[PDB]
Motif scaffolding. Structure first.
Motif, mmCIF file in Angstrom:
data_model
loop_
_atom_site.group_PDB
_atom_site.id
_atom_site.type_symbol
_atom_site.label_atom_id
_atom_site.label_comp_id
_atom_site.label_asym_id
_atom_site.label_seq_id
_atom_site.Cartn_x
_atom_site.Cartn_y
_atom_site.Cartn_z
ATOM 1 N N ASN A 161 -20.536 79.185 -14.167
ATOM 2 C CA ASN A 161 -19.219 79.445 -14.737
ATOM 3 C C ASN A 161 -18.673 78.244 -15.496
ATOM 4 O O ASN A 161 -17.463 77.984 -15.495
ATOM 5 C CB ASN A 161 -18.220 79.854 -13.659
ATOM 6 C CG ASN A 161 -18.710 80.979 -12.801
ATOM 7 O OD1 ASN A 161 -19.324 81.929 -13.281
ATOM 8 N ND2 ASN A 161 -18.425 80.892 -11.509
ATOM 9 N N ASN A 163 -19.118 77.723 -18.916
ATOM 10 C CA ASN A 163 -19.117 77.976 -20.352
ATOM 11 C C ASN A 163 -20.039 76.989 -21.072
ATOM 12 O O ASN A 163 -19.681 76.363 -22.075
ATOM 13 C CB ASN A 163 -17.697 77.940 -20.929
ATOM 14 C CG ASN A 163 -17.661 78.319 -22.403
ATOM 15 O OD1 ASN A 163 -18.421 79.170 -22.862
ATOM 16 N ND2 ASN A 163 -16.759 77.703 -23.145
ATOM 17 N N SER A 191 -15.269 84.515 -20.462
ATOM 18 C CA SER A 191 -14.903 83.237 -21.068
ATOM 19 C C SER A 191 -15.568 82.057 -20.371
ATOM 20 O O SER A 191 -15.828 81.026 -21.008
ATOM 21 C CB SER A 191 -13.382 83.059 -21.021
ATOM 22 O OG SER A 191 -12.908 83.167 -19.701
ATOM 23 N N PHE A 192 -15.825 82.185 -19.070
ATOM 24 C CA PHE A 192 -16.436 81.152 -18.251
ATOM 25 C C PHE A 192 -17.954 81.240 -18.199
ATOM 26 O O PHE A 192 -18.591 80.338 -17.648
ATOM 27 C CB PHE A 192 -15.899 81.269 -16.805
ATOM 28 C CG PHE A 192 -15.992 82.664 -16.270
ATOM 29 C CD1 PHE A 192 -17.190 83.156 -15.775
ATOM 30 C CD2 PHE A 192 -14.909 83.515 -16.319
ATOM 31 C CE1 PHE A 192 -17.300 84.470 -15.367
ATOM 32 C CE2 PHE A 192 -15.003 84.821 -15.868
ATOM 33 C CZ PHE A 192 -16.195 85.300 -15.397
ATOM 34 N N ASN A 194 -21.784 80.897 -18.372
ATOM 35 C CA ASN A 194 -22.827 80.124 -19.014
ATOM 36 C C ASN A 194 -23.691 81.037 -19.882
ATOM 37 O O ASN A 194 -23.618 82.279 -19.829
ATOM 38 C CB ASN A 194 -23.684 79.396 -17.988
ATOM 39 C CG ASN A 194 -22.992 78.209 -17.375
ATOM 40 O OD1 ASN A 194 -21.933 77.784 -17.835
ATOM 41 N ND2 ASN A 194 -23.595 77.646 -16.335
#
Length: 279
Positions: A161, A163, A191-192, A194
């Motif tokens: 998480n 990004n 949005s978070f 990876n």
């Protein structure tokens, strides 16, 4: 079978389009498969698990889920209302303490535990492990995940998480397991989440309703929530005889919804887990 007013992520996994609310699935529902949830534990008495969950190992003073995270993930795998594979057997391995943390040596021991322990369980349709956890790159953590996969377990792991490119995280960066990114209800990369070449697949990860401790429910977000959608999907497909532990990640990628997601960085797959169930 059809479950009306399902969590959006269940509806998404059985749909060619976002924006629907019914989950469609073959009634076999992962019966005869098993999924290990390697996490903070599982509150196995939750009515949503219907007696199909049990703890098999802890590395701490208790096997109780005092956090909720593991119960939530197990619910997305296999709870009656919130789960992908509503008849699978769930096995909890508590490698994370009640604050959600765990030493890599304990996590490794838990993965090797599952590789052996499956020989003590009845899973005629196959075995999956869901790892909604991770930290910085570790070759030893990756090797443990690789061994678990090699032993005949479909290993699904959270991308993380940050990004950021998942190459710098473990077990996300292990090539031989199924690394899972997160999407939202509008088919955007969460949005978070990876990203990067090591991701194999995306699953629903933003605002996922599932079981929680104290016999409750709540909605939370993370690649931790996407991972059990893929783990449950693998168990479901193995019960149907469509794939095997060794090939389930590739099969899920082969049969995924392709090109539906937005804000996918160049070089990351645009593949969203899909059960291809035709009612």
């Amino acid at each position: 079978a059809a479950q009306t007013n399902a969590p959006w992520g269940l509806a998404r996994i059985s749909s060619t389009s976002p924006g629907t609310s019914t989950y469609y699935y073959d009634e076999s529902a992962g019966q005869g498969s098993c999924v290990y949830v390697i996490d903070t534990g599982i509150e196995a008495s939750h009515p949503e698990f219907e007696g199909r969950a049990q703890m098999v190992k802890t590395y701490y003073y208790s096997s109780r889920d005092g956090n909720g995270h593991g119960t939530h993930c197990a619910g997305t795998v296999g709870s009656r209302t919130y789960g992908v594979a509503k008849k699978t057997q769930l096995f909890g391995v508590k490698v994370l303490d009640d604050n959600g943390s765990g030493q890599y040596s304990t996590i490794i021991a838990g993965m090797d535990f599952v590789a052996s322990d499956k020989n003590n369980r009845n899973c005629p349709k196959g075995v999956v492990a869901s790892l909604s956890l991770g930290g910085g790159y570790s070759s030893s953590v990756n090797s443990a995940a690789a061994r678990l996969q090699s032993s005949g377990v479909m290993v699904a792991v959270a991308a993380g998480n940050n990004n950021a490119d998942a190459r710098n995280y473990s077990p996300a960066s292990e090539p031989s397991v199924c690394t899972v990114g997160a999407s939202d209800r509008y088919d955007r990369r969460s949005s978070f989440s990876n990203y990067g070449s090591v991701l194999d697949i995306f699953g629903p990860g933003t605002d996922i309703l599932s079981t929680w401790i104290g016999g409750s429910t709540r909605s939370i977000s993370g690649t931790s929530m996407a991972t059990p959608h893929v783990a449950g999907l693998a168990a479901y497909l193995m019960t149907l005889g469509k794939t095997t532990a060794a090939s389930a990640c590739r099969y899920i990628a082969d049969t995924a919804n392709k090109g539906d997601l937005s804000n996918i960085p160049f070089g990351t797959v645009n593949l969203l887990a899909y059960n291809n169930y035709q009612a």
